[PDB]
Amino acid sequence: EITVKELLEAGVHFGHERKRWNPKFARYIYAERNGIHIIDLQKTMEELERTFRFIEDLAMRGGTILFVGTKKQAQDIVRMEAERAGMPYVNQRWLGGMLTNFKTISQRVHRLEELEALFASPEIEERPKKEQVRLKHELERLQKYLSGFRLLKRLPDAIFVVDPTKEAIAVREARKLFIPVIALADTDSDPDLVDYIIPGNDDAIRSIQLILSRAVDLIIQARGGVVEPSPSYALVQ
Amino acid sequence: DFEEKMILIRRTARMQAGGRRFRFGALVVVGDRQGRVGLGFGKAPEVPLAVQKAGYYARRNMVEVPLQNGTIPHEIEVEFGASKIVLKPAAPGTGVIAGAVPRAILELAGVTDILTKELGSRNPINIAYATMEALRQLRTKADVERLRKGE
Amino acid sequence: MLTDPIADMLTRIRNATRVYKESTDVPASRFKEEILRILAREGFIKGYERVDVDGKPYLRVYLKYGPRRQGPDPRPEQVIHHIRRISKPGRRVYVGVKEIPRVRRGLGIAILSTSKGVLTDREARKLGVGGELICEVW
Amino acid sequence: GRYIGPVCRLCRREGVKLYLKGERCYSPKCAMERRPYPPGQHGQKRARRPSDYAVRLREKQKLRRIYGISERQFRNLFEEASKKKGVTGSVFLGLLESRLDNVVYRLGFAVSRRQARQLVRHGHITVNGRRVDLPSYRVRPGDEIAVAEKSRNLELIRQNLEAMKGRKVGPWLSLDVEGMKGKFLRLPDREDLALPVNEQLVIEFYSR
RNA sequence: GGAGCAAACCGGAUUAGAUACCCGGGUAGUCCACGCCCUAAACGAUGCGCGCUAGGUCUCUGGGUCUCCUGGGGGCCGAAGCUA
RNA sequence: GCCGCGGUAAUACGGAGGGCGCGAGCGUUACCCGGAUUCACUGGGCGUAAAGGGCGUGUAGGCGGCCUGGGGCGUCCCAUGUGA
Numbered sequence: 051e052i053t054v055k056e057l058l059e060a061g062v063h064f065g066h067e068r069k070r071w072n073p074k075f076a077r078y079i080y081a082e083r084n085g086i087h088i089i090d091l092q093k094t095m096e097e098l099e100r101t102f103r104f105i106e107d108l109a110m111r112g113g114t115i116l117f118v119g120t121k122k123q124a125q126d127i128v129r130m131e132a133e134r135a136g137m138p139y140v141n142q143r144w145l146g147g148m149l150t151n152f153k154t155i156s157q158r159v160h161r162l163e164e165l166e167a168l169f170a171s172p173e174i175e176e177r178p179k180k181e182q183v184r185l186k187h188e189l190e191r192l193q194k195y196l197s198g199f200r201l202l203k204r205l206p207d208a209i210f211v212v213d214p215t216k217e218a219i220a221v222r223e224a225r226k227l228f229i230p231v232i233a234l235a236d237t238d239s240d241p242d243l244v245d246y247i248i249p250g251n252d253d254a255i256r257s258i259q260l261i262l263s264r265a266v267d268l269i270i271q272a273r274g275g276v277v278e279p280s281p282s283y284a285l286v287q
Numbered sequence: 288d289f290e291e292k293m294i295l296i297r298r299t300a301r302m303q304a305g306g307r308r309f310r311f312g313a314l315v316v317v318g319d320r321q322g323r324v325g326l327g328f329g330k331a332p333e334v335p336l337a338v339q340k341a342g343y344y345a346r347r348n349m350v351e352v353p354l355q356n357g358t359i360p361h362e363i364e365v366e367f368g369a370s371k372i373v374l375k376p377a378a379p380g381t382g383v384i385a386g387a388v389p390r391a392i393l394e395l396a397g398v399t400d401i402l403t404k405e406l407g408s409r410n411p412i413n414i415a416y417a418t419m420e421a422l423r424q425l426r427t428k429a430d431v432e433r434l435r436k437g438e
Numbered sequence: 439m440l441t442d443p444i445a446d447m448l449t450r451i452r453n454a455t456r457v458y459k460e461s462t463d464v465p466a467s468r469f470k471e472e473i474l475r476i477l478a479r480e481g482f483i484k485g486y487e488r489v490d491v492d493g494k495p496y497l498r499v500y501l502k503y504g505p506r507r508q509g510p511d512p513r514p515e516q517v518i519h520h521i522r523r524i525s526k527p528g529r530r531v532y533v534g535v536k537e538i539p540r541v542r543r544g545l546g547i548a549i550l551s552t553s554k555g556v557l558t559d560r561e562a563r564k565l566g567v568g569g570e571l572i573c574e575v576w
Numbered sequence: 577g578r579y580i581g582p583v584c585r586l587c588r589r590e591g592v593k594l595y596l597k598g599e600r601c602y603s604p605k606c607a608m609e610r611r612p613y614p615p616g617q618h619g620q621k622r623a624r625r626p627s628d629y630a631v632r633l634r635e636k637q638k639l640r641r642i643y644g645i646s647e648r649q650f651r652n653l654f655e656e657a658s659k660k661k662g663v664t665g666s667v668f669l670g671l672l673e674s675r676l677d678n679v680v681y682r683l684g685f686a687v688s689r690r691q692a693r694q695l696v697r698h699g700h701i702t703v704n705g706r707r708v709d710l711p712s713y714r715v716r717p718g719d720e721i722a723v724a725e726k727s728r729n730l731e732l733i734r735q736n737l738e739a740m741k742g743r744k745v746g747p748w749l750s751l752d753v754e755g756m757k758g759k760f761l762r763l764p765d766r767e768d769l770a771l772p773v774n775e776q777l778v779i780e781f782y783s784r
Numbered sequence: 785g786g787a788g789c790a791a792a793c794c795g796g797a798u799u800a801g802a803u804a805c806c807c808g809g810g811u812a813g814u815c816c817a818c819g820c821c822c823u824a825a826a827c828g829a830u831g832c833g834c835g836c837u838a839g840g841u842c843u844c845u846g847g848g849u850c851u852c853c854u855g856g857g858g859g860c861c862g863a864a865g866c867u868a
Numbered sequence: 869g870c871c872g873c874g875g876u877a878a879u880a881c882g883g884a885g886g887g888c889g890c891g892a893g894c895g896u897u898a899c900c901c902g903g904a905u906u907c908a909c910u911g912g913g914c915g916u917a918a919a920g921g922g923c924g925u926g927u928a929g930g931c932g933g934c935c936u937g938g939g940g941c942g943u944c945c946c947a948u949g950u951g952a
């Protein structure tokens with residue numbers, strides 16, 4: 051569902067950053083109780099609704115969302131939430147021009163489906179073992195970086211970010227491309243440059259997961275058939 | 288449909304062991320005379336490539352040139368770097384009064400009659416980039432009031 | 439010290455809008471309000487309430503801004519693009535009904551104090567007066 | 577005084593027919609249907625991208641060379657025209673056409689402007705019934721341009737007027753072919769006559 | 785007044801030369817008082833006073849209900865903005 | 869005129885052919901305004917490009933905070949004369 055209680059959000063899912071902040075978390079900040087800045091969970095909702103409202107309005111009209119999360123705290127959680135939504139993602143090091151230069155970056159996804167469908171083909175042993183290994187090594191390279199980018203043979207209509215700061219690069223072109231920006235960002239990064247914000251702990255899996263996990267449920271409820279709460283509470287904490 | 292027109296070309300020069308290499312600069316202006324112009328600067332190892340990629344960039348940049356009958360809505364001026372340009376609106380029958388740089392931009396945007404001067408730095412490149420901002424900052428009586436109604 | 443209060447306010451405003459904020463205050467003045475009185479009625483701003491700051495009477499001035507644009511620099515357009523003082527204390531500028539300005543071929547406004555109160559580039563011409571030309575805004 | 581000598585060469589210096597000749601500059605060529613290129617040893621050679629100046633210089637010479645009028649008398653008009661208000665550019669050609677030697681060329685009394693001058697000059701032309709031997713004469717609404725009696729003959733006039741049958745006059749003129757009389761009805765807007773000349777380029781050339 | 789130092793000066797070296805750099809001597813001067821001189825890369829190469837426009841960290845010095853907040857200073861990185 | 873042309877292939881010297889520009893004129897020199905926004909009232913500068921006085925104190929001078937009243941000098945409107 052799209053509904054979300056303020057109880058399970060009670061773990062760390064509201065500001066974990068302090069003074070390492072951007073002073074533009076004005077509206078999105080409650081108090082500085084004990085070092086860390088705590089985020090007014092109340093406004094989150096309103097920002098959420100406004101955000102989800104666009105997520106469904108876009109998901110229910112057959113769009114595509116690109117997920118970016120290089121962070122290790124929210125690294126794999128994107129892989130399972132992106133694959134569980136059939137949508138593209140960036141689990142590894144985000145490359146420059148992946149959008150503004152998407153045209154040429156794509157050509158390098160195109161090396162992969164030539165390498166991909168040549169692992170079982172006939173003309174394989176014909177090429178000396180000296181030449182092989184490396185190729186599959188290369189193939190492994192491509193997959194590592196392009197697994198969640200392998201799909202989506204065109205620029206998305208919006209992008210979801212685990213943190214606009216860690217990835218400002220990613221928003222910058224996207225933003226240069228008029229592409230709308232959704233993201234979860236703790237007091238670290240500055241809003242404004244964000245179109246639809248998820249004002250909360252962009253670190254600490256507990257918080258992150260909680261969001262995306264359901265969040266992606268709302269993405270499925272855009273076509274119909276929301277099932278099991280996708281992978282999660284694994285070795286969570 | 289679009290009318291290309293480069294108003295500046297030059298040969299820079301870098302230097303390396305034994306001799307000096309050259310790139311080429313291309314300043315091209317694009318428009319339609321409807322009220323839509325674009326400006327792009329293209330560098331390339333040779334002449335054409337630049338010119339060609341100038342129009343490429345020049346089409347990536349455009350403008351809402353509001354024309355109150357071959358002129359502009361209000362009196363505007365804009366300072367870019369050390370260079371300054373003056374656009375004062377003129378009544379029909381006057382013509383475009385400006386250097387060979389700015390006129391080339393006003394034409395491709397229509398503009399039947401206007402008064403202008405270049406102040407400070409006369410460097411075309413900076414005059415160019417200075418002129419677009421001017422236009423990119425024009426507001427018709429309509430664009431204005433909208434704001435002065437609020438909510 | 440404040441060798442010029444009016445200018446201070448104009449600048450007090452100019453410096454707020456540049457950074458985008460909801461309201462900045464400014465020391466109370468009969469003449470100061472009659473000036474803001476123009477900006478409200480001309481929609482250059484919202485309004486203001488004779489607020490108080492520690493016994494000292496100020497004027498919380500409320501600013502309007504265009505719609506949140508998108509792309510690089512989502513910061514909105516300015517409702518008040520430009521504002522500068524004309525008749526300063528170091529040089530007073532006095533003009534007659536025939537020597538009145540012409541801000542942006544109508545697109546702007548001009549504020550001047552006359553023997554018939556605080557008027558506008560227009561009203562001055564309508565009333566048929568003239569006096570100290572305060573500033574210009576657009 | 578006025579220009580004298582090679583003119584078909586101009587016909588092709590600007591790269592456009594301008595019918596300064598009678599039949600010829602109007603027959604198969606101003607010597608151009610033969611050679612549509614610029615005079616001088618460097619004719620059959622490619623040209624260099626004409627500068628914004630040379631363009632306005634050329635587009636100007638074109639117009640002045642058309643009415644075959646000195647740079648003197650010429651600019652005097654533009655200034656007088658520019659002095660006015662409205663558009664000036666349009667007003668300009670207005671003062672150009674108002675010339676006496678001009679009206680005559682249009683009213684078919686002569687084939688060429690240079691032939692039209694000889695007429696006015698020698699005194700074989702009239703205006704409201706006056707001997708006007710001055711090609712500089714400016715004409716207004718309703719002015720009658722006919723031939724004088726001493727001249728209402730001449731084997732050259734009948735030919736010119738005769739050829740004028742099977743031909744029309746400007747929306748600002750009217751000829752009594754059979755009587756030798758014509759009238760200046762109004763000042764012909766830019767529309768009333770189309771030309772290889774963009775005035776606006778001539779306006780620019782004068783704001784050096 | 786004069787220990788140390790040290791323009792000028794003398795001697796030893798180096799060098800083609802070495803009126804220098806290096807070594808050994810050495811006078812004014814460097815020190816005090818009184819009276820002059822009034823210059824300088826006298827520099828932050830940034831005149832003085834007042835108001836307005838994010839913050840982060842280090843340090844000196846106050847005041848407080850003393851994790852902190854608050855005032856006056858002294859550095860660094862930096863919002864917006866200015867700048868060739 | 870400025871930038872610069874001439875060193876045995878000079879569209880830059882000298883002549884020729886040809887072309888461009890004007891025409892009883894076409895050139896030159898000199899002088900004034902323009903461009904020069906390059907004295908900047910309109911309409912500029914002073915960290916490193918020329919430019920903050922070596923630093924204070926202070927004279928005259930310029931400038932001056934919130935409310936209310938008299939005066940109405942400046943300022944503003946109208947009217948009239950004069951501005952041949």
Ligand SMILES: [Mg+2]
């Ligand atoms: Mg660029």
Ligand SMILES: [Mg+2]
Binds near residue numbers: 368369
């Ligand atoms: Mg500047």
Ligand SMILES: [Mg+2]
Binds near residue numbers: 407408
């Ligand atoms: Mg300059």
Ligand SMILES: [Mg+2]
Binds near residue numbers: 409410
């Ligand atoms: Mg220049």
Ligand SMILES: [Mg+2]
Binds near residue numbers: 661664
């Ligand atoms: Mg006119």
Ligand SMILES: [Mg+2]
Binds near residue numbers: 782783784
């Ligand atoms: Mg001129």
Ligand SMILES: [Mg+2]
């Ligand atoms: Mg010695």
Ligand SMILES: [Mg+2]
């Ligand atoms: Mg020796």
Ligand SMILES: [Mg+2]
């Ligand atoms: Mg010897």
Ligand SMILES: [Mg+2]
């Ligand atoms: Mg010694």
Ligand SMILES: [Mg+2]
């Ligand atoms: Mg010693």
Ligand SMILES: [Mg+2]
């Ligand atoms: Mg002595």
Ligand SMILES: [Mg+2]
């Ligand atoms: Mg200072």
Ligand SMILES: [Mg+2]
């Ligand atoms: Mg203490």
Ligand SMILES: [Mg+2]
């Ligand atoms: Mg401090």
Ligand SMILES: [Mg+2]
């Ligand atoms: Mg800094």
